[PDB]
Every structure is written in structure tokens, then in C-alpha cells.
């Protein structure tokens, strides 16, 4: 199944075959050789990619809208050390308790697909999803889209999601490291780079 | 088959489908050895029933004391109040009376259907066929635990669940008054006042 | 077929495994049947080992029991004393019992003589303690073929070892615990000299600061 590759002139790894969404035969280290580990890795990829989408949004959009617009969030790096409705070391435990349920349901789905597709309270609110990592139902795909019967448009949308998500992952890693080193926010750094593309770089520290 | 403690899992072989409250919750396999299962089900029956009674003496008193209808002392301070008898004497009298009742139950567990007759008067008999559920006119004055097997599981399941919750609640009170040094009901009405700064973590 | 500690070609010739604790450890060849004599012979050494071990089991669990029970606080503290301060060695310490320790020693000698001489006469002449009248209970003290294991209605009144396999395993367990208790009593003695405090005190000192409380740091005596 010849397809575009990360490295045009390379033989695709045998275990990869292009069926998975966003599969470009990029396994230089041969980590996803074992099929079961490959399945686990694709689930991990999906979850990291979505969490990175959310993190990039919440890191940049507020900071895109502070130098302009209205929302004056001072920074995302010092956003943690603030005051809120509840303290930090117990907000953490509240988050852990609230997330244990959902994370356990997803874990059970990964180990045993289909066992966690029913609402525990009312045994009628199913989820209508047979592809792992994409439950669907009415909390995850409320606005119809998400299924296409038997076609490949869904595969294209899957690839779009994977690719946007890898971009978001890289962007948030850049946000973290570039905040750690430049001692400054991301958006003003972008503006400064645009001002002087040449001298303002990773070398003028 | 039945809803287990984990939605996706396989119940242990020994906990097939029978005992009331059976949810296949045995991660540590503490009843795997044959014969031990009967001992444990009786053991949990005893703790839960005791815990039900122990929770009604730790919360209901304080429940209708804080609002105020009885003015009883706290659960964790009732062990020093002077009563008509002595604390030590009350302990020993309990021990002997507990010894008789516990010993009668023990003989039933070891040899089922052997302690079913009244010693003083060999005419009164105790209505009971399942170990751990002995009826008669004393334990079962209303006949609410005999008949079709279907309702037996329901009521027995209702019994154990309230008991399991009761055992958990009393454990709280023990530890939960130990560190906070305050009554249980006081903690409830202090948790609904400012919930987000009254937590286990903020008690060290 | 079994664990060997420091066996030799000579030792393994006569140590085959019949005895409970038989692991071939005989570097000095003290149980060689070729030169069997009065007390150095195959018939006496296992018996002497068992008896020394049983008295050592009583000693190791008795030289430390009062101290432990007083530390947990259920015996009087004045009776919670190290073993060497209980009048066994009056110079290091003495205790006032109902009788002075020499009268107690004479009573002990009389009672232990009545017991020990009978044990000896059953060892040398088996079954001889079940014939002559002895307050009517000479029939309980008849013993069996093996001197170390009488197993009568008195010496075995819970009736362990109904089968031979469990009986032999229990023998091996007895021999091991006895050897451990003997080594423990030797440790009690040496630690009493080198430390001046009871065995439980030494254990707690080691458990507190193991690297500064050991033989290397504590051969300064005091």
C-alpha cells in the first residue's frame, strides 16, 4: 500500500501498513512492532494529541487575546500560583477523583472493548461506537458527525485530527521549553521574531 | 452475568453466583481455599450487623443532640460517664453474656442444625435453615425472612449493603473523630457550610 | 538428597539421614562408630544434643521473657529484670525470693534428681521406670524404644505425631529450634559479659541505631 512517507526513499516498516489514520511509516526506532503494544500506543497517541490540543488552545488563545482583545490573563506559566474558589493541593485531589471514573472506563474499554458502552444508571443510553478511542454517543459526538457507514471520509477526518494534534503537541512542548529559557511568554516572542527574524533567534540570549 | 465491582472483568471462580451481595470483589483471593468461604460470609454478616447497631449509637444520638432532643454525651466520650454499674463490671458482664451468645452461634457454624432447641424448655424451637439467619419468635417475630428464594436474596442483599455502608461509616467516625477531635454530625454540618475548605487533606 | 553444611568423606560414611537434624556436619568426627566410648558414641550424642537443646529452648524463652513482659507492661517492673540479675549470679544482681538461693538450689537438686535419675535409668535400661511402684503413676513414665522421645500419656497428652511423616518433620523442627536456642543462649552469655544489659535491651539498641550499636562499637564493655 504505497503512500506518502515521512522519509520519501525508505521502505515502510512491515508492521505498519497505512490502515491506521495518520500512518506515514515513521517507526525509526521500531517501538510499535508488537501488535498489542501498537494498539496501546495508538490509544496513547490519541489521548496525548487531544490533551495537547486543549493545552495549546488554553496556552495560546488567552495569551493571543491578552496582547489584544479583552481577556488579560497575565501568563500561563505563573497562572498556577494564584487564588481560586479552592486551594491547589485539594483541587488536585478533586481533579483526581473526578477523572478516576472516566479514565477507568476508558481503560476498561481498551482492555475489553464494548463493556463500558452503557450508562450505569439508565440501561438505555448506549454510546454506539465500535472503534476504540472514539466512543461517540451524545457526549462525545453530539453534532452528528463521527460516523460515515462504510467509507473513507472518516479516515480522512481521522488523519486531520491526528495531524492537528501532533502539531498541538509540538507547539505545547515549545511553549514549555521556550518559556523556561526565554523567560517570557509565547505570543510576544512571536511578535519579536517577526520584528527581527534574523538576530532574534535561539542564539541571541 | 451480574454487575461486578468493575464493569470489565471476570468474577473469581469461587464467588460464582450464590451468596447475597456477590459482586466478585476478591482481588486478594482471601477466600480461595475451600471451606473458608463459609467462614468469611458469616464473619462479614457479624461485623455488618454489629456496625449497623454501632452507627445508630454514634450518629442518631448526636443527630438528635446537636439540634437537641436528648442531650446525650458524644460517642467518643461515653466511655467515661459514670453509670449505675461500674465500667469494669459492665465489661465483665458483657464478656460472659457475649460468651454464651457467641458460643451458641459458634456451635451452629461448626455443626449446622445442632443448637436449634431451647435448653431450659425442650419445646420451644428456633425457626432456621440457613446458617447465619436463625429465626424463631425472638430473632424473627414477624416472619419476614421465610418463603420464596427470590425475596430472600433481595432482603438479604438489602441487609448486607446497608451493613457494608454502616461498617464504612463507623470506620470514618473512629479515624475521622480521632484526627479532627470533633463529633461526626458536627463534621457533617461543618462540611455543608464551607465544603471546599473542609476536607481530609486540610486536617493532617 | 539433603543440604550439606561442612560434611566430609569421613563424616558422610556414618551420617546418612536417619537422625532428624542430620546434615553431615561432623568436621571433628565425634560420632564415628569405630571408636565409640562412654559419652562420645552414636547413642548418646544425639540424646545429649536434644536435651541441651530443650533446656536451651526453655532458657532463651525464659532469660528474656520477664524483660519483654515488663517492657509491654503486664508483670511488675521489679520482676522485669535481666536474667543475670535474678540471683543466678548474686554479684551482678540479686533478688529476694521466698527462700534463699541455696535452699532453692537444694530443692532444685532434689526435684531435678528425682526426674533426671529416672530419665537416666530409662536411657540405660529402657522400660525400667514402669515396673517399680512410684506413687501409682509409674505406668505413665514407661517411655518408648527411643530415650529422647518417651511420648507417654504425660509427655504427650495432646497426641502429636499420629502419623510417621508429620512425626519426623516435627522432630526435625524440634532439633532446629533447639540448635537455634542453644546458639541464642551462648549469645545471651557473651552479650551479658560484653554489654552489661539484657538481651532485649541489646536488640532494641541495635534496632534503634544499627550502625553505631553492634559488636564493633560495643566491645568497649560499658
Amino acid at each position: 500500500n504505497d503512500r506518502p512517507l515521512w522519509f520519501p526513499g525508505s521502505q515502510p516498516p512491515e508492521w505498519l501498513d497505512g490502515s491506521l489514520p495518520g500512518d506515514f511509516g515513521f517507526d525509526p526506532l521500531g517501538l510499535g512492532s508488537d501488535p498489542e503494544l501498537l494498539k496501546w500506543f495508538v490509544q496513547a497517541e490519541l489521548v496525548h494529541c487531544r490533551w495537547a490540543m486543549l493545552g495549546a488552545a488554553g496556552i495560546f488563545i488567552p495569551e493571543a487575546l491578552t496582547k489584544a482583545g479583552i481577556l488579560n490573563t497575565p501568563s500561563w506559566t505563573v497562572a498556577g500560583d494564584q487564588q481560586y474558589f479552592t486551594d491547589a493541593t485539594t483541587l488536585f485531589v478533586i481533579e483526581i477523583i473526578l477523572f478516576a471514573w472516566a479514565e477507568g472506563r476508558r481503560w476498561a474499554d481498551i482492555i475489553n472493548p464494548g463493556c463500558v458502552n452503557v450508562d450505569p444508571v439508565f440501561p438505555n443510553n448506549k454510546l454506539t461506537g465500535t472503534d476504540v478511542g472514539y466512543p461517540g454517543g451524545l457526549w462525545f459526538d453530539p453534532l452528528g458527525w463521527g460516523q460515515t457507514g462504510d467509507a473513507a471520509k472518516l479516515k480522512d477526518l481521522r488523519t486531520r485530527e491526528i495531524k492537528n494534534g501532533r502539531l498541538a503537541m509540538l507547539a505545547v512542548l515549545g511553549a514549555v521549553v521556550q518559556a523556561n529559557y526565554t523567560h517570557t511568554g509565547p505570543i510576544d516572542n512571536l511578535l519579536a521574531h517577526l520584528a527581527d527574524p534574523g538576530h532574534n533567534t535561539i542564539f541571541a540570549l | 452475568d451480574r454487575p461486578l465491582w468493575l464493569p470489565g472483568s471476570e468474577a473469581p471462580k469461587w464467588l460464582d453466583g450464590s451468596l447475597p451481595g456477590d459482586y466478585g470483589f476478591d482481588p486478594l483471593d482471601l477466600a480461595a481455599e475451600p471451606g473458608r468461604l463459609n467462614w468469611m460470609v458469616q464473619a462479614e454478616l457479624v461485623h455488618c450487623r454489629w456496625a449497623m447497631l454501632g452507627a445508630a449509637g454514634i450518629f442518631i444520638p448526636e443527630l438528635l443532640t446537636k439540634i437537641g432532643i436528648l442531650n446525650t454525651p458524644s460517642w467518643y466520650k461515653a466511655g467515661d460517664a459514670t453509670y449505675f454499674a461500674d465500667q469494669g463490671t459492665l465489661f465483665i458482664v458483657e464478656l460472659l453474656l457475649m460468651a454464651w451468645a457467641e458460643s451458641r452461634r459458634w456451635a451452629d457454624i461448626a455443626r449446622p442444625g445442632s443448637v436449634n432447641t431451647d435448653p431450659i424448655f425442650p419445646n420451644n424451637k428456633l425457626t432456621g435453615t440457613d446458617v447465619g439467619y436463625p429465626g424463631g419468635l425472638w430473632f424473627d417475630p414477624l416472619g419476614w425472612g421465610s418463603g420464596s428464594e427470590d425475596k430472600l436474596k433481595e432482603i438479604r442483599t438489602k441487609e448486607v449493603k446497608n451493613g457494608r455502608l454502616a461498617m464504612l461509616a463507623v470506620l470514618g467516625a473512629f479515624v475521622q473523630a480521632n484526627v479532627t477531635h470533633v463529633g461526626p454530625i458536627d463534621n457533617l454540618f461543618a462540611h455543608l457550610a464551607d465544603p471546599y475548605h473542609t476536607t481530609i487533606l486540610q486536617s493532617l | 538428597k539433603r543440604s550439606l553444611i561442612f560434611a566430609s568423606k569421613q563424616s558422610l560414611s556414618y551420617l546418612d539421614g536417619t537422625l532428624p537434624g542430620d546434615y553431615g556436619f561432623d568436621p571433628l568426627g565425634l560420632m564415628d562408630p569405630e571408636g565409640a566410648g562412654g559419652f562420645i558414641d552414636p547413642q548418646w550424642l544425639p540424646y545429649a544434643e536434644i536435651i541441651n537443646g530443650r533446656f536451651a529452648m526453655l532458657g532463651a524463652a525464659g532469660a528474656i521473657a520477664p524483660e519483654v513482659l515488663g517492657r509491654i507492661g503486664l508483670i511488675p517492673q521489679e520482676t522485669a529484670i535481666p536474667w543475670f540479675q535474678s540471683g543466678v549470679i548474686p554479684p551482678v544482681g540479686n533478688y529476694s525470693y521466698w527462700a534463699d538461693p541455696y535452699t532453692l538450689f537444694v530443692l532444685e537438686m532434689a526435684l531435678m534428681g528425682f526426674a533426671e535419675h529416672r530419665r537416666a535409668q530409662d536411657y540405660y535400661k529402657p522400660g525400667s521406670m514402669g515396673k517399680q511402684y512410684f506413687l501409682g503413676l509409674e505406668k505413665f513414665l514407661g517411655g518408648s524404644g527411643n530415650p529422647a522421645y518417651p511420648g507417654g500419656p504425660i509427655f504427650n497428652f495432646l497426641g502429636f505425631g499420629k502419623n510417621e511423616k508429620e512425626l519426623q518433620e516435627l522432630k526435625v523442627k524440634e532439633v532446629k529450634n533447639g540448635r537455634l536456642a542453644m546458639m541464642a543462649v551462648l549469645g545471651y552469655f557473651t552479650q551479658a559479659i560484653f554489654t552489661g544489659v539484657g538481651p532485649f535491651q541489646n536488640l532494641l539498641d541495635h534496632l534503634a541505631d544499627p550502625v553505631h550499636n553492634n559488636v564493633l562499637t560495643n566491645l568497649k564493655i560499658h
Binding site: - | - | L4, S8, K9, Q10, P27
Partner: protein, 81 residues
């Protein structure tokens, strides 16, 4: 005391003697010395778990001689320097 010169000397002497006895550089229970100081093999009859043939008696002998030599060296170095 672990880093002291006495400790180092004693450890080195004992280790060297044990190494010599174990690796056939000194007489042992299974390594007899002839009149020409050549080491021949003998059956001492003591079974040991050491593949080479180092016995418990060999260990005790080597340790004792190593301690003797180490004490000699320590006291000599103290008296001289």
C-alpha cells in the same frame, strides 16, 4: 576507622592471603608443599562448595595467617614510622 591505614593494611593482607590460597599461590588443605616448594594436589577429604577446592579450614588458615602478617606489618610501620 574504615579508612584508617591499619584497616587498609589488615584488609589488604587478609585479602592477599585468601587470594593466594584460593588461586593456588599458597599451600592449602588440598595443596601440599614438597621439599622443593612445589605445590602438589592431595585428597584432604573435606568437601567444599568452592569449585577450585577452597575449604572452610583453608579459609580459616588463610585468614589467620593474613591477620598475623597484617598485625606484624601494622606494628612494624607504627614502630618505625
Amino acid at each position: 576507622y574504615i579508612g584508617s591505614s591499619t584497616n587498609l593494611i589488615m584488609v589488604a593482607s587478609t585479602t592477599l592471603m585468601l587470594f593466594a590460597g584460593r588461586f593456588g599461590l599458597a599451600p592449602s588443605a588440598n595443596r601440599k608443599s614438597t621439599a622443593g616448594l612445589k605445590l602438589v594436589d592431595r585428597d584432604s577429604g573435606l568437601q567444599t562448595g568452592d569449585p577450585a577446592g577452597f575449604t572452610a579450614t583453608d579459609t580459616l588458615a588463610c585468614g589467620a595467617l593474613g591477620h598475623v602478617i597484617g598485625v606484624g606489618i601494622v606494628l612494624g610501620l607504627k614502630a618505625t614510622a
